[PDB]
Amino acid sequence: GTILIDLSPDDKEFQSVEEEMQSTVREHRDGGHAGGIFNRYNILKIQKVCNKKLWERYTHRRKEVSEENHNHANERMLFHGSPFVNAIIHKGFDERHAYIGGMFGAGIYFAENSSKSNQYVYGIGGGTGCPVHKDRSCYICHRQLLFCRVTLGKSFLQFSAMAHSPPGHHSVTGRPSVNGLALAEYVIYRGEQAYPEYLITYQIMRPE
Template structure:
């Protein structure tokens, strides 16, 4: 754990640590000496075996994200769920077509990985600038954290701040790490939808998620109890109607299995 060795004496007094104390994450702080947290990651089920067996590799990550080529995580499982395709049609997620024609969502199971993540000294982004954080040259995308003010050291990770705490772009926080040794998968949460007929009023279309799908928000943030009952927001959201007759359903996330991986 390179970050813990380098920063454990000063990290608790760093500006980023003080900031996160005032604007805490939804997930518990596991180790203040390293700013270690549980964070969620959602992806296509086809690459889950690779993530669980050999780990993530930021060197081959998608460079089209807001913060360049890194490994993206979230404190909200509902944020990570936006990147998980429908198990039936492989659609209805960010970076793919939003249309989903599957009417039996409650029959599907999918997985979200809970990573034990060392954030270290975090660079907090409130005012997003594409040329700095993503890069304007596709052949030379950003693949590392920014330099600190002394211009000699790099930050250990990046946090895109949400609008609730003064960010200008994101509805939910994003966490990006660029080193392959900063996180490991501790739990695999297997989720199944539980369907309940209900109707919600129109939701505003502003924001990435609602604009992306262009439909009512027919799911809700539900409180569930993941491993050790310590993560308070294991909620799953899908923005879609489930039937052709115009009826809409709330999809509650129900944990089927919680598998500790280490």
């Protein structure tokens, strides 16, 4: 039931999504090991993901969470990188998209920094890099990230350097406590608490 609608680069929606992608790049403590060495992207395409059934599943859960949290869903737009993006846009998020070994337990992980989500496009730790060249810093191959609508509800704050949400909470927030330039990461434990709204196709750019 999924269709993908191409956005024009002249569309304000394309431009605001691209700006969020580009402006949330940062340097990573691995010196580029997992995601590659870059300061910006070449955005090739941005598609809107349209699936009525998946959207209704999201909004149903969002209403449940809102009602448990003084009419506040605490909805964010966050990045998700995964080798399973093609499954996710067709069938939705579920337990198979969880990071079993994540620092906040087995849940589905999202990032404010697009460059954090970029580290996971080819697998955990970048896997073995792109399928074609086996290069985690490949500047040729096309990569894809999701820009997702995510319901956090009442989020458990973890200060730091599928399972269940902590009791009385709907998500976990991983607050950076060492790297002053890192943005937060978030974990949900129910696939219905995210909708994969934009599919972004891109390359990382080699710095000059």
